[PDB]
Structure 1
Amino acid sequence: AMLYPVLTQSRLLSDLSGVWNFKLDNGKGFEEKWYEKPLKDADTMPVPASYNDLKEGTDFRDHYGWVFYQRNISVPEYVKSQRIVLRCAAVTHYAMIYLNGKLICEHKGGFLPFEVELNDDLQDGDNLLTIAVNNVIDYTTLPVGGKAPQNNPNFDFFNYCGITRPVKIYTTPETYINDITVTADIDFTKEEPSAVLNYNVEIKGITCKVELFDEEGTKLSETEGSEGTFEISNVRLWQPLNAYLYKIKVTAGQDVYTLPYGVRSVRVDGTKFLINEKPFYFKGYGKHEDTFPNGRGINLPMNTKDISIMKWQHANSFRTSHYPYSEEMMRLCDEEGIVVIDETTAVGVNLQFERIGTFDKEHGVQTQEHHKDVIRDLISRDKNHACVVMWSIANEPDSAAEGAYDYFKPLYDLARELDPQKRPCTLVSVQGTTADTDCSSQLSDVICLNRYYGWYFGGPDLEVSETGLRKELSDWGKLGKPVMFTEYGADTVSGLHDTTSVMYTEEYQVEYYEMNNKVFDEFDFVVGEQAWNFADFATSQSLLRVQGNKKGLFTRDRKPKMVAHYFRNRWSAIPEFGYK
């Protein structure tokens, strides 16, 4: 369980972000005890941020192995009173915290938070904090390092690493709040729908009371109970592009924490994805925590810029593509009313492109245990987010291979059981699968395709490509379930133009999406269009990557390609609800 550190009367918060000392491991790093003494001949390195692009030459950009972040720490003795904790929101890949020279914590997983307490190794005076980060990826990591001394991603984005998100120090009373959970039942029956919310607070280390406020701070109800309930008639339902967030003050044993919460219902019904009992239609794109020169590092300004562009463009949703995003971005979609598809680090679980099969148990992937710890850690983190309407177990696994069904079912189950809101589960299907062959047809509530008819398939022949896409999508309808496209797009170099289009031209990109959009619009069970990608992003080099991935509607610096004006006009004529 991981609550978002905030400033409360009961808890303090001090950011450690800034320029830290930094050294690339030379192999002999751990041998000598760098985590013991202050790094020598060190380099400077802002935190929070990916370090790959922040220096010059390939030696930083393409480093294999470990790096050492190092910074000094010092708390006021008058604080030992309360509990001292170190929250690392995300260290890409493996983290190893040393204080004063001793290991204190260790973590696997580059995109989710982890904490460690400091009360009993926090010395007096100036303490030597050391965070060593490893970037190696393999068949035991999610995301999955392939075989082709260098990391070779089995995924189409660059392997940005370092202290990707912030490192803070918060405190707490000795017995504290540790995990608040809230769910809602809404009775749309009444012409003025109302709702009953179920609280479930948890403490560790006494009386606990719950206060419920409205948008403006107006209190409206109170109760006591580490597992009580609450009633709200004439309830302001959170809605896509129309967020309403209540707030919640849990006072419990000299400790109080506040939580926003939006009241809405998610439910699949036949070929309809329903939000607050209405037939939604996804409009938006798959995104990437990718900016220059931050790498995958957190970027509050671009977060707001990205959401400003989405509203300008008349979109309503995005998918945390290939990894969970920052907590800040998740809260922002709550405030702004952005429907989010929250997705795990499970990309590259596919060895298809003697031959080893993906789910061979001696020579194939070794990810299921960690895949489970991710599903749990992620749902623990974002369970209370009204923006989250669905979960994505994995992006493009070899889901039509043998071993496939056996791999994923234990993970779907774990997901369906750990979501206090029992939200729809899916996985994003790669090109090649079909209704009959895809283990997703059974395990998933929503069929999410990534199809590229007009690019990989059939490009530059958009007629032949249309025939293919009708044929395949037609078949997908026989499952009687909601199907949305989570990726489709074409690599386009901003600036390349032509009257009779050729591939890579802004005109070819617009035509591609006209064909796909025409076919989408023929099937009432298509409940979503999400283009890949929102914006150009960095990938590993290869002959097929024109200085990265150029499938964005926008450039890496958020300037619109012609296609961005095509979608803005199309999405403006398509409602959040009732499109079918």
Structure 2
Amino acid sequence: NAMLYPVLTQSRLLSDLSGVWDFKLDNGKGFEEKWYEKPLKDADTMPVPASYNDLKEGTDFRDHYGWVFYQRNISVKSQRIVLRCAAVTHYAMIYLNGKLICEHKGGFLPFEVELNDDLQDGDNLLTIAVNNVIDYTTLPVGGKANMMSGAGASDKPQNNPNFDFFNYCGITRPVKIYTTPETYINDITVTADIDFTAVLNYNVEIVELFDEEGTKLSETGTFEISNVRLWQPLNAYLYKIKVTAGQDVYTLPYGVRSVRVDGTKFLINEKPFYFKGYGKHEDTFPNGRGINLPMNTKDISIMKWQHANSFRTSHYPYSEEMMRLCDEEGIVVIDETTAVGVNLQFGGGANFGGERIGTFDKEHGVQTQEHHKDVIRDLISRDKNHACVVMWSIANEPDSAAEGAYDYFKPLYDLARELDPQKRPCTLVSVQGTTADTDCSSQLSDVICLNRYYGWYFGGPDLEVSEIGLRKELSDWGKLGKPVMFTEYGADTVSGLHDTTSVMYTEEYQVEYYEMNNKVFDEFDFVVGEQAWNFADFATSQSLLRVQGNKKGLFTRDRKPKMVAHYFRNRWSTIPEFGYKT
């Protein structure tokens, strides 16, 4: 249930296992050969943490279907030993000296196991198999053909993702080893009540406030009170929390923050906020989905350079190392689960009995609601203590208007409200074609988050006509008395393509696209957020509509800016975080 971010404490070690491991692609005849027992033979090398897909050469390597084998030797005994894999994508089986230890369905969330039992003296063998297969039982969801069918599924077995990004798999995030005394802290939970005319509830499970610079303060289930400094967007401030328990210490950073909705207003510390930012990705070269601390810190600089404040974990939980990094710098975050691809209208929907299949058919449709719940639990049981997180996104672009939509998301929306000790807003982002009167999110989500492409997929290159449809659909969402946010809107743009009389795919059309849309966003006082799609270019599956990946980014994959990054930087320079609307 509960995972705490490991760190050097007076009671706990932290031995990182990151490095170059032994690696082998499964050829089917792998598990019967019991490769997990003896050290890998004819093994190649692969760094950890990283996605393997882009680190060796060849289509047969990048597009491999099935299992891969990471191997590594280990050595160390009086303390509780535990092996936390920060993330394995997607499925993982952790052998050790041949004997299985753990399994995990879940590609972008951490899990730990006990280590004292089993284990030996030294020179014992660690093996981790990773599977990449996605289908109707996985999150993210894999289909049975290409997503952009509006290449035939033939011959060789492969993964056909129901999502517009590449299936970067492997040990994406680090593998560490921390220790604990036989009695340990297992979870911390701290809350806040502010008197805007400053008390911190703080349950624990199996304590001293500290202030930013370190000047120690109050001491003590717990509770506190002080004259506090507010955590603000682009103005962070983190108190420290030193938990002293059964001869064990874990330190915790906390920010004082209040989020609630008052109709058409998103309140951050009782002020009228405005989202300025992007949908992002964990996408670099050549790490793929692997973690890249430099690029994380680098994008933060660019975002402050570009006068932003927000972004969304599209379309999966990010790294712990980044969420904390968003606490330090004061970046508003919209956290999101792995629930993308819950939509069987993409491409040609599956056809069991000669007729199309709805998304939530009980027999031939999505079979994810169970695993969907654990993800909501494990995610909120991880990021509950981040002031950067002001909202949860239960899913990206699902069939939120089909039979079964409401009855699918209702229990998930409630589980979200039940487990967040702060009662944060919850939402899902809506596909195009979804209207206010037909969306299961119109009476379920506290804010309306839209993904609309008026002037690109729908209406391009006629920007006059596309503007009419955008206004028509936007006036129709105002009738909910809820806030409306745009989480995706963009236009593919190849860097270096120009013209004075702009056509599609040029840097000039990309600016005119955003000029038209933002001109309409400003006409409505219930729009409390513009989030561009995308922050940077990123890799996808191969298709005719994908020019070496998704070029909708404001920046390139090497983070170099396009002409639109300078448009948004000038625009977002004169738009405040608070009171842009009032």
TM over 0.5: yes
1:400-448 deviation digits (Å, cap 9, x = unpaired): 0000000000000000110000000000000010000000000100000
Shift of 1:280: 0.2
Aligned-pair CA distance for 1:297: 0.3
- How far did residue 234 of structure 1 move? 1.9
CA contact (8 A) 1:324 1:345 kept: yes
Structure 1: how far apart are the matches of 2:504 and 2:449? 26
Alignment partners' CA distance in 2, 1:406 and 1:250:
42
Contact 1:487 1:532 in 2 (8 A): yes
Aligned length: 558
What is the CA-CA distance between 1:122 and the residue it aligns to? 1.2
- Please report the TM-score for the alignment, with normalisation by the length of structure 2: 0.95
Q: Secondary structure at the match of 1:334?
A: helix
1:139-195 per-residue CA deviation (whole Å, 9 max, x = no partner) reads 000000001x00000000000000000000000000100000000000011xxxxx1
Give a deviation string over 1:231-272, Cα, whole Å, max 9, x none: 333201100000010000000001010000000100001000
**Matched residue, 1:100:** 97
Over residues 39-74 of structure 1, what are the superposed CA-to-partner deviations in whole Å (9 max), with x where a residue is unaligned? Answer: 000000000000000000012100000000000000
Give me the whole-angstrom Cα distance separating, in 1, the residues matched to 2:467 and 2:240.
Answer: 48
2:336 aligned with 1:336, yes or no?
no
1:283 aligns with 2:276: yes
Instruction: State the Cα distance separating 1:522 from its structure 2 match.
Output: 0.4
CA shift, 1:371, in A, is 0.3
Per-residue CA deviations over 1:489-530 (Å, capped at 9, x if unaligned) read 000000000000000000000000000000000000000000
Q: Following the alignment from structure 2 to structure 1, what is the Cα–Cα distance between the partners of residues 233 and 119?
A: 45
Q: Is the 8 A contact 1:446 1:481 kept in 2?
A: yes
Q: CA deviation at 1:125?
A: 1.3
CA distance in 2, matches of 1:13, 1:485: 41
* Post-superposition CA distance 1:433-470 (Å, at most 9, x none): 00000000001000000000010110000000000000
Deviation at 1:285, TM superposition (A): 0.4
Partner of 1:268: 261
State the secondary structure of the residue aligned to 1:442: coil
**Runs (5+) with no aligned partner, structure 2:** 145-156, 346-354
CA displacement at 1:127 relative to structure 2:
1.1
CA distance in 2, matches of 1:230, 1:312: 39
Q: CA deviation at 1:230?
A: 3.0
Answering whether residue 248 of structure 2 is matched by residue 255 of structure 1, we say yes
How many Å separate the matches in 2 of 1:157 and 1:109?
Answer: 17
Structure 2 SS opposite 1:335: helix
Partner of 2:396: 395
Identity %: 99
Quote the Cα distance in structure 1 between the aligned partners of 2:362 and 2:240: 48
For residues 183-219 of structure 1, give each alpha carbon's deviation from its aligned partner in whole angstroms, at most 9, with x where no partner exists: 0000011xxxxx11011111xxxxxxx1100001111
1:361-404 deviation per Cα after TM superposition (whole angstroms, max 9, x unaligned): 10000000000000000000000000000000000000000000
Distance of 1:394 and 1:371 partners within structure 2:
9
1:544-566 CA-to-partner distances (Å, cap 9, x unmatched) read: 00000000000000000000000
Q: Could you tell me how far apart the structure 2 residues matched to 1:329 and 1:361 are?
A: 38
Q: Distance in 2 between matches of 1:573 and 1:459?
A: 29
SS, match of residue 190 in structure 2:
strand
Task: Give the deviation of 1:36 after TM superposition.
Answer: 0.3
Once residues 116 and 276 of structure 1 are traced to their aligned partners in structure 2, the CA distance between those partners, rounded to angstroms, is 39
Matching of residues 138-287 of structure 1 within 5 Å: 138-147=135-144, 149-189=157-197, 195-202=198-205, 210-223=207-220, 228-287=221-280
CA–CA distance in 1 between the matches of 2:449 and 2:579? 20
Q: CA deviation at 1:488?
A: 0.1
- Kept in 2, the 8 Å contact 1:241–1:336? The answer is yes
Q: In the aligned structure 1, how far is the partner of 2:31 from the partner of 2:385?
A: 41
User: Equivalent residue of 2:449, what SS?
Assistant: strand
Deviations 1:4-53 (A, max 9, x none): 01110010000000000000000000010100000000000000000000
Deviations 1:83-125 (A, max 9, x none): 0000000000100000100100000010000000110111111
Distance 2:293 2:259 in 1: 28
CA contact (8 A) 1:22 1:68 kept: yes
Distance 1:368 1:483 in 2: 27
Q: Distance in 1 between matches of 2:212 and 2:226?
A: 15
The 1-side partners of 2:287 and 2:323 are apart by 19
Query: SS in structure 2 opposite 1:479?
Result: coil
Task: Give the distance between the partners of 1:342 and 1:83, measured in 2 at CA.
Answer: 32
Q: Distance in 2 between matches of 1:233 and 1:500?
A: 60
Contact 1:221/1:230, CA 8 A, preserved across alignment: no
Q: TM-score, structure 1 length as denominator?
A: 0.96
- 2: CA distance, partners of 1:469 / 1:129: 55
Measured in 2, the distance between the counterparts of 1:339 and 1:127 equals: 44
Contact 1:144–1:153 (CA<8 Å) still a contact in 2? yes
Indicate the SS of the match to 1:186: coil
Match of 1:192 in 2: none
The secondary structure found in structure 1 opposite 2:510 is helix
Match of 2:436, SS state, is coil
Q: Secondary structure at the match of 1:140?
A: coil
Aligned pair 1:350/2:343, yes or no? yes
User: What root-mean-square deviation, in Å, do the aligned CA atoms of Structure 1 and Structure 2 show?
Assistant: 0.6
Whole-Å Cα distance in 1 between the matches of residues 208 and 226 of structure 2? 16
Does the alignment pair 1:51 with 2:48? no
**Aligned partners of 1:270, 1:451: CA distance in 2, in Å?**
22
5+ long unaligned stretches in structure 1: 190-194, 203-209
CA–CA distance in 2 between the matches of 1:217 and 1:123? 42
Q: Is the 8 A contact 1:53 1:61 kept in 2?
A: yes
Output the CA distance in 2 between the equivalents of 1:126 and 1:388: 42
CA distance in 2, matches of 1:122, 1:82: 13
Q: Distance in 2 between matches of 1:22 and 1:231?
A: 51
Partner Cα separation in structure 2 for residue 125 and residue 83 of structure 1: 17
Structure 1 residue 479 displacement after superposition: 0.2
In structure 1, distance between residues paired with 2:62 and 2:522: 44
Structure 1 contact 196–229 (Cα < 8 Å) conserved: no
Could you tell me which of 114, 117, 125 is aligned with 2:122? 125
Q: In 2, distance between residues paired with 1:394 and 1:51?
A: 27
Asked if structure 2 preserves the Cα contact closer than 8 Å seen for 1:35 and 1:101, the reply is: yes
Q: Which runs of 4+ in 1 moved over 4 A?
A: none
Distance 1:221 1:101 in 2: 50
**In structure 1, what is the Cα distance between the partners aligned to 2:576 and 2:226?**
27
**3-state SS of 2:223 partner:** strand
Aligned to 2:77: 80
Tell whether the 8 Å contact from 1:427 to 1:448 is kept in structure 2 after alignment: yes
Following superposition, the deviation at residue 347 of structure 1 comes to 0.2
Aligned to 2:191, the other structure's residue is in SS state strand
Q: Hey, what's the Cα distance between the residues in 2 that align with 1:453 and 1:331?
A: 35
Q: Secondary structure at the match of 1:303?
A: helix
Offset of residue 229 of structure 1: 3.2
**Kept in 2: contact 1:284–1:318 (CA 8 A):** yes
Do structure 1's residue 38 and structure 2's residue 31 form an aligned pair?
Answer: no
